[PDB]
Design a protein around this ligand. Structure first.
Ligand SMILES: CNC(=O)c1cnc(Nc2ccc(F)cn2)cc1Nc1ccccc1S(C)(=O)=O
Ligand SMILES: CNC(=O)c1cnc(Nc2ccc(F)cn2)cc1Nc1ccccc1S(C)(=O)=O
Lengths: 248, 247
């Protein structure tokens, strides 16, 4: 249950970047500025995991969640028509403004992210792709929108799950609990100005880090919170009601 | 008058474009900045470039771009880098898809900056879409654009007749052979904005542009009352920016 968009209602503009099995563009929707996520020519299992994301995002409403307008089918291409956010991905912005991002600013983003994830938790819904790249800035206090997760995690290959380390929950390498790990790793990425740990490490090194059960570094007002979220035991991770209450 | 910047504090990068007697580059200041590199010039030209740095260093307004100072045979104005660049370039890229409400925001922000200059009895002398820079695009829902009026570059008084003729239709007709000239500049800029970065007479030759002003021909209608009032050949008949801003 998502809206079907005819290709006559959309205009594809400049390439913005790439997602997992997708090419992201700016566009218009008849007029609104939108973001088009063009899925690669794919088999039905991949397309279905992309429809599941459109469905999930069409059934939710939260101020810190980006809007999904619907889905367009253009030949072998599936297009998710989504909300355009002014300043784009958070990680890109953090690397541009490195050393000049206040801790109070980072705490606002963390609270807004926990708020969106608490809402998904209450509805027993899984995002499965929480990372700085999927955090979009509507305003630079800041105002964030968590993007759709793209092709659902369950449809991806081991190689793609290994690429998602350290954001990927370790139990997903071979539940709502995976988003606490995602949130925790995202907090480290925010503290480190868009420089996530293990980003210079090879796939074998990333996989060995998880296989040996090595823990990620400490970020100071967030060290306890991240350490609790970044536990290999999913049941031991705190709830977002706890995380959100503790951020206040 | 303005801050002096040593060549050791600035790094020159990508070539953005050209200005009147300048080459505009992206740069770094030990901050991302814009470097306005003056061509090898006579002292009258350099002095008119210093007058601009001096004028822009003595002003502070949210819709006016910042001047960091000057680096001194090379005269380099070190200025504020504005994210999306020139308005006219953007308008031509987005032709047919720019809402009227968006254009009205830009017009208000421009009149606001020019009202501030008017109150201080300061003359810009180069109001055009090219000198309007977009800090924000106002593309997302419930977001409006945010403009910064650039410095005027080499002051009008130092330029040749050929360069003043090239500035038509933005150039006030009394300048071809006062704060009043910025009302004409503003009016012509409003036409350019309404026409999606396509100013009138832009395809016309220098002889044609000069004949248009010499015969006292009036520019087309786009805001129609406001532009018609601003684009009058009698400088005293042009409305004040307090009137323009209030309207
Ligand atoms: C749900 N909508 C989005 O995901 C989305 C919304 N607004 C954007 N604004 C923007 C503004 C300026 C700019 F320079 C770049 N982007 C970017 C977006 N995605 C994006 C864009 C590029 C690369 C990766 C992604 S992603 C999250 O899809 O991986
Ligand atoms: C006072 N500061 C400026 O003038 C200035 C500030 N930011 C710019 N950002 C920008 C961003 C993206 C892009 F692709 C191009 N430019 C361009 C600028 N000038 C400029 C640049 C090229 C041509 C003409 C001028 S001009 C006004 O000097 O005539």
């Amino acid at each position: 249950s998502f809206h079907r968009v005819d290709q006559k209602e959309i205009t594809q503009l400049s390439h913005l970047g790439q997602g997992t099995r997708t090419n992201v563009y700016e566009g218009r929707l008849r007029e609104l500025r939108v973001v088009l996520k063009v899925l690669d020519p794919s088999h039905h299992d991949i397309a279905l995991a992309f429809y599941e994301t459109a469905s999930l995002m069409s059934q939710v409403s939260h101020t810190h969640l980006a809007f999904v307008h619907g889905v367009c089918v253009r030949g072998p291409e599936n297009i998710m028509v989504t909300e355009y956010v002014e300043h784009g991905p958070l990680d890109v912005w953090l690397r541009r403004e490195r050393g000049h991002v206040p801790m109070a600013w980072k705490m606002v983003v963390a609270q807004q992210l926990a708020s969106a994830l608490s809402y998904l938790e209450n509805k027993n819904l899984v995002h499965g792709n929480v990372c700085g790249r999927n955090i979009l800035l509507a305003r630079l206090s800041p105002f964030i929108k968590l993007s759709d997760p793209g092709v659902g995690l369950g449809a991806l290959s081991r190689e793609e799950r290994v690429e998602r380390i350290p954001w990927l929950a370790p139990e997903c390498l071979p539940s709502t609990a995976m988003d606490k790990w995602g949130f925790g790793a995202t907090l480290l990425e925010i503290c480190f100005d868009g420089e996530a740990p293990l980003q210079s490490r090879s796939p074998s090194e990333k996989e060995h880090f998880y296989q040996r059960q090595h823990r990620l570094p400490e970020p100071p007002q967030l060290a306890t919170l991240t350490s609790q979220c970044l536990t290999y035991e999913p049941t031991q991770r705190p709830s977002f009601r706890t995380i959100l209450r503790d951020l206040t």
